[PDB]
UniProtKB/TrEMBL annotation:
Gene3D superfamilies: 3.10.50.40
Family, as annotated: Belongs to the FKBP-type PPIase family.
Binding-site positions, Mg(2+): 55-56
Alphabetized GO MF terms: metal ion binding; peptidyl-prolyl cis-trans isomerase activity
Coiled coil: none
InterPro entries for the chain: PPIase_dom_sf, PPIase_FKBP_dom
Name of the protein in its database record: Peptidyl-prolyl cis-trans isomerase
Name of the gene this protein is made from: fbp
Domain PPIase FKBP-type: 30-117
Length: 117
């Protein structure tokens, strides 16, 4: 209403939006935690959903198997927290893209949800 639909952008260029506040503990650099990522196309079509495959992305805050948006969200989110990270095709898959599912010049959205720390 007063300005909740705001858009944040880091030095990298990516943009994300807070979905829900976590009701547990916050993650810390060097700590291992398990989170779920929900892929979404520019139209809103879910091309990827680890939640459906029960394959939660578990890693330590500070690794190198994720993107700035992920790290940034991990260094602040808490157990049960929900954060939507939106990254462009230039800072995401690349000018090459995946293939049909996620072509170039197409922004991709990912929903990160903290499961446990």
């Amino acid at each position: 209403g007063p300005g909740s639909m705001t858009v944040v952008t880091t030095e990298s260029g990516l943009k994300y939006e807070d979905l829900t506040e976590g009701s547990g503990a916050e993650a810390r650099a060097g700590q291992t935690v398990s989170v779920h990522y929900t892929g979404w196309l520019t139209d809103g079509q879910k091309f990827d959903s680890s939640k459906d495959r029960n394959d939660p992305f578990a890693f330590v805050l500070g690794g190198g198997m994720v993107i700035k948006g992920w790290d940034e969200g991990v260094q602040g989110m808490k157990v049960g927290g929900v954060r939507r990270l939106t990254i462009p095709p230039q800072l995401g898959y690349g000018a090459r893209g995946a293939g049909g599912v996620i072509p170039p010049n197409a922004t991709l959205v990912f929903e990160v949800e903290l499961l446990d720390v």
